[PDB]
Symmetry: D2
Subunit: 125 residues, 4 copies
Amino acid sequence: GMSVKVSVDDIDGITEVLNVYMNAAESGTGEEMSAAFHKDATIFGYVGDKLAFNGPIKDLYDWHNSNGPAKNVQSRITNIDIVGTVAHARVEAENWTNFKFSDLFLLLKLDGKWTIVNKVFHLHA
Amino acid sequence: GMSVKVSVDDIDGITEVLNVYMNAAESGTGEEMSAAFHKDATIFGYVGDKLAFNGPIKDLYDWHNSNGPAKNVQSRITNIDIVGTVAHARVEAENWTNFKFSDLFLLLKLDGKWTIVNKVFHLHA
Amino acid sequence: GMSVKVSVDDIDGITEVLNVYMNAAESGTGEEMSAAFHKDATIFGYVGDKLAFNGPIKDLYDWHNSNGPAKNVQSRITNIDIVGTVAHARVEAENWTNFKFSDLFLLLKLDGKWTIVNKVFHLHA
Amino acid sequence: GMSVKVSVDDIDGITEVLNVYMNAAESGTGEEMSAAFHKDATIFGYVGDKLAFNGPIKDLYDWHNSNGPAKNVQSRITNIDIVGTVAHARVEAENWTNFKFSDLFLLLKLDGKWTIVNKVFHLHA
Ligand SMILES: [Cl-]
């Protein structure tokens, strides 16, 4: 039986995968960014009043490749809520190519290794 | 651009959709439960060592139909983190047909109405 | 020692004491409001540039007596983070005599029953 | 008029002060730890059945001088919830002289400088 007692181990595991994403946002490609995600991960988010992202995580990688690396981006984790095999995380990004993002994540501990399965975001006005 | 200031309106909209899910859990069918979810919603979760839920939200509605309503279930919302057009939410369920769940949700304000796009859970040992 | 696994029982206990605060805010006196707080509870908060609340919880009850009940107030619990014998909780208030507050709480399970020990708030501009 | 839009600036100020605490907990004295706390900060917490910490923050600095620095402690921020002038934050400590803590904080932007005004903790069994 597994304990849900929050450990520094799990905090670090989640932080690590989150860093994989934050580091690809700054310096990497959509293929490098996909290393932080489950093969069937999803993403939802509005660009204006258009739902530019409506499920397929492939749209995030393709977008990151067109828009390019955000050399000046500043990303911070602000919440890691862990319970056994799943978790929630929040990341705030600023100057992601002049964009300000609030990212919400759901993560799964897939075979002992944490990975992002879901992502939603809000573009700030 | 939608303001990210947290409003009582938004809190009640999210509570309202989570009530659809929680009430369906106790007294409803999987079809009634699906009223709280996006058409392309997902669900990930472990039962033992098997990843019984690996994306398709259909697996949720099918399992709720087979397992039937949890008449003795007690569920509570413990967190609602809102930011404009998306949100996170946590729900604790007990005696869901003798099960204990921690649910993590990602929500989207689709066309002015809140709906669950993602769900992960932990089954307590 | 006590387990930190989150239970519906504790959730309800905290909700209940937070109810004592939200109901007194709307209808009760400062003396009725203090029933939700430890004897040595505190409160910090700015009104403009002045730190009108800088420790003594006495000041909360006195202000709620002069200002009087907020009949039109809508208050909601949005977060309850529980870890064994202590917890954090957030509450959003609107039209508290025309004010809009965000409340952050620390609570203590004192002798098996939850009570608020710390309070801080932000008056929305 | 202040905005409550969560900024990387405030996330960095809160991380700053919290680091002064974590660092003093590892390598510093009680007076160095005091640098991260308001003059009238509080601390509640149980050691067994006894409420060893029942308000005075003086007690924390006294106990850290007696107990000495936890050279082996691994500490991690897990939550920064910010709203204007106040905030909540959580920190997980392990091997704090063999102790495991969960720290729930309430902070205040006292004259533009974040500082910890409240602390509660749970000592894991
Ligand atoms: Cl994005």
